């Protein structure tokens, strides 16, 4: 048995040496030349009140006009962003919703939580009332993030250390992703959809093959749990947010950490992370009741988005990059621009 | 400015808002309780007895008061990342059995640790706790089989039920690191039928009265 441990240690040392050999020049040194982005001023264009409990997740529609938000009050509210109007109000079977997702085509919206089940809702049914389409059971731990890979199949990350890919029409998970020591907390699909990356409480992020069904790379460097993770728009990098009060940028091809976003005055964790359309900005929520805009290339604090009275729980930048909406535990979503 | 169906959509949104407010006002009056403790501490026995793969929700009704009990023992997953969603729970029910000395893998001390963590959690500073010292009946002979010396070498009283039960109650209540913010209600259920729900109702109404006193400024 000890031989396997020695082999694993040798392999880890080889990985460390190989990654060290690649780090010829730090990102900070190469990006020091570029001009820095000035202070970023953003104001709340909309305040989407109506929730009566903590907002735990939100997702934009691909049309950049519709967004959905889930909360402990047990309701999914689909907002018309441009006019603050409610388009739908789905009453959840279980009010312990920890995530939500909006399908690429806008037909389906899904959510899940402590009930261990990913529910799928029809938004364009003939009867006229949004109704649950199928309940994807099979997980053993709370759901932490759902993302619609396609109108017919989605990938879920649970609290039982496993991410699984579901076939909506059939209702069973075709592929199961295992290898996380700790429970998974967030998930993000690549722009090309071929790969997705998940970060867990074991302080490590994994890159998975959606089709092949096996892990490709594991990225470490965080000191604590990774609450949130997001893909860089180019699809060759992703940024993680952890409880140790630092966001960090990982690169798939370089296969090693690339830059860390930390401040001395920032001592609390990160609840959500998102990128701007061009990728030059790395917005990230914090438990100190406000979000900070990070210059993804210089790691400088380019701005701050304060205005929530409680921990910010979720945020996301529209597909056209026009606005960023942040939802917090005070039951208010504010759309900045 | 608004067109015809824009006004229609605004009316639909206002109707949805009215429904949301009505549902929220209905749900605010409901009493939410969190059930904790070891799986073998009689949680299932008490919940099934006192009934009028994830979180299990139980609904009661007593004296025109609606209870919502969230039994979360099935969540074999890391805490501290879903416990914070129970911040607003009115009270926490904690079931501890007095017949766990025999099992060693230290059960009575696991319950002690869990009670300490749940009472001093930063999310439950104000949430009062309701203890249920289960398994009282068979504890009467189990203490005879094994005096309390096996668990509390510092115990100074006599090895009798009337003394040991009180000693355990004080040991549990002392574990509270913050006496003033939250109170602890103790009850020796002994697998009784009607006293469990009645005690839950009494503790809940006392907690609600004190919450209103705090809100209105009398406290």
């Amino acid at each position: 048995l000890d031989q396997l441990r020695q082999e694993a240690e040798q392999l880890k040392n080889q990985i460390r040496d190989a990654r060290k050999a690649c780090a010829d020049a730090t990102l900070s040194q190469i990006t020091n030349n570029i001009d820095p982005v000035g202070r970023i001023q953003m104001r709340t264009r909309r305040t989407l009140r109506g929730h009566l409990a903590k907002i735990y997740a939100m997702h934009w529609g691909t049309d950049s006009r519709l967004l959905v938000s889930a909360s402990q009050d047990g309701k999914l509210i689909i907002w018309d962003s441009y006019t603050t109007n409610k388009v739908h109000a789905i009453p959840l079977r279980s009010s312990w919703v920890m995530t939500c997702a909006y399908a690429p085509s806008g037909n389906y919206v899904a959510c899940g939580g402590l009930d261990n089940i990913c529910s799928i809702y029809n938004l364009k049914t003939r009867e006229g009332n949004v109704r649950v389409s199928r309940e994807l059971a099979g997980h053993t731990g709370y759901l932490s993030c759902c993302r619609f890979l396609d109108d017919n199949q989605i990938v879920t990350s649970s609290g039982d250390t496993t991410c699984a890919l579901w076939d909506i029409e059939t209702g069973q998970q075709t592929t199961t992703f295992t290898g996380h020591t700790g429970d998974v907390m967030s998930l993000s699909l690549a722009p090309d959809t071929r790969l997705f990356v998940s970060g867990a409480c074991d302080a490590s992020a994994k890159l998975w093959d959606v089709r092949e069904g096996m892990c490709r790379q594991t990225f470490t460097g965080h000191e604590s749990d990774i609450n949130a993770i997001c893909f860089f728009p180019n699809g060759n990098a992703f940024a993680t947010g952890s409880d140790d009060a630092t966001c960090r940028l990982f690169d798939l091809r370089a296969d090693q950490e690339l830059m860390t976003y930390s401040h001395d005055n920032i001592i609390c964790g990160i609840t959500s992370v998102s990128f701007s359309k061009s990728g030059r900005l790395l917005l990230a929520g914090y438990d100190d009741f406000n979000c900070n805009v990070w210059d993804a290339l210089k790691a400088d604090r380019a701005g701050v988005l304060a205005g929530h009275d409680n921990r910010v729980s979720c945020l996301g930048v529209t597909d056209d990059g026009m606005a960023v909406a942040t939802g917090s535990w005070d039951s208010f979503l504010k759309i900045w621009n | 400015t608004l067109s015809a169906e824009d006004k229609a959509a605004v009316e639909r949104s206002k109707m949805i808002d009215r429904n949301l407010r009505e549902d929220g006002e209905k749900a605010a009056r409901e009493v939410k309780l969190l059930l904790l403790g070891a799986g073998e501490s009689g949680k299932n026995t008490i919940v099934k007895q006192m009934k009028i793969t994830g979180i299990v929700e139980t609904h009661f009704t007593f004296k025109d008061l609606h209870f919502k009990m969230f039994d979360v023992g099935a969540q074999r997953s890391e805490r501290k990342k879903w416990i914070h969603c129970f911040e607003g729970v009115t009270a926490i029910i904690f079931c501890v059995a007095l017949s766990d000395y025999d099992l060693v893998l230290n059960r009575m001390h696991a319950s002690m640790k869990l009670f300490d963590s749940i009472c001093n959690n930063k999310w439950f500073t104000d949430t009062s706790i309701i203890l249920f010292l289960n398994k009282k009946d068979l504890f009467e002979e189990k203490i005879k089989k094994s005096p309390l010396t096996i668990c509390y070498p510092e115990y100074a009283g006599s090895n009798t039920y009337e003394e040991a039960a009180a000693y355990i109650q004080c040991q549990f209540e002392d574990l509270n690191k913050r006496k003033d913010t939250k109170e602890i209600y103790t009850h020796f259920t002994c697998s009784t039928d009607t006293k469990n729900v009645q005690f839950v109702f009494d503790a809940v109404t006392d907690v609600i009265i004190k919450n209103n006193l705090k809100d209105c400024g009398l406290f």
Epitope: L66, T83, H88, E127 | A4, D6, K7, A8, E11
Partner: single-chain antibody, 232 residues
Framework: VQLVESGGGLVQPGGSRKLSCSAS????????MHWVRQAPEKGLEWVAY????????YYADTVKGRFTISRDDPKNTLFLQMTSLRSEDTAMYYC??????????????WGQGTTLTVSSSDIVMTQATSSVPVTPGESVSISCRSS???????????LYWFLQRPGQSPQLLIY???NLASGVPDRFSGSGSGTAFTLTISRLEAEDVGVYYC?????????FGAGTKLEL
């Protein structure tokens, strides 16, 4: 989804009636409901509208005061109390579905129709040609024009196209003049500009024969076109 309606028959002038619409198979409590009436040989004519929850009620100026529209959501039925009828009130009456929210498709479903026979500022919509012969496999363009541009400030051209198959209630084809209604063969392609609209059919086939009615929705009262009839 199914909308039955009844109450029609022979009525003397100056009488009254209570047309009933029974809604089955959809959430009637959340749908705004219209009453669209078609003369024995003329085009459609909007009559009344009641929103969800009965908050907003409109009547055509031609029938204001005469009729009263009410709904009973628990009973899942829509009522139109009509009194003091005249010779001009003889027409089919269609209970027309309508749901308004961002991206919805109002007027999607139309009732079967009730035959009521009485014993003996508004935007103007004009259709260029009353009838145009057609052949299978050919392309046909139907042209329509309004009085004032329907392109509202928010960018939606509130124009609709309806096809009335011979002997059947009309069904929605195109809403907002560009969006295609669900369930249609997808051959139709509606396009147009402000105050000028047209409907294009590619590879015309059987079952497309009928009368096409345009309808604006920018502001009430809603106005239908005369209608263009396709003949084989």
């Amino acid at each position: 989804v199914q909308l039955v309606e009844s109450g029609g028959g022979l009525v003397q002038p100056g009488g009254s009636r209570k047309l009933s619409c029974s809604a089955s198979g959809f959430a009637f409590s959340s749908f705004g409901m219209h009453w669209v009436r078609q003369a024995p040989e003329k085009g459609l004519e909007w009559v009344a509208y009641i929103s969800s929850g009965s908050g907003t009620i409109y009547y055509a100026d031609t029938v204001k005061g005469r009729f009263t529209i009410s709904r009973d959501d628990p009973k899942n039925t829509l009522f139109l109390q009509m009194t003091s009828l005249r010779s001009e009130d003889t027409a089919m009456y269609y209970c027309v579905r309508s749901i308004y929210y961002y991206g919805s498709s109002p007027f999607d479903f139309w009732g079967q129709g009730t035959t009521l026979t009485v014993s003996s500022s508004d935007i103007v919509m004009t259709q260029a040609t009353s009838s145009v012969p057609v052949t299978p496999g050919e392309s046909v363009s139907i042209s329509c024009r309004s009085s004032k541009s329907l392109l509202h400030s928010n960018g939606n051209t509130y124009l609709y196209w309806f096809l009335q198959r011979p002997g059947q209630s009309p069904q929605l084809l195109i809403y907002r003049m560009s969006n295609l209604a669900s369930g249609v063969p997808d051959r139709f392609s509606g396009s147009g500009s402000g105050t000028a609209f047209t409907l294009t059919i590619s590879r015309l086939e059987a079952e497309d024969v009928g009368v096409y009615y345009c309808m604006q929705h920018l502001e009430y009262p809603l106005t239908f076109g005369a209608g263009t009839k396709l003949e084989l």
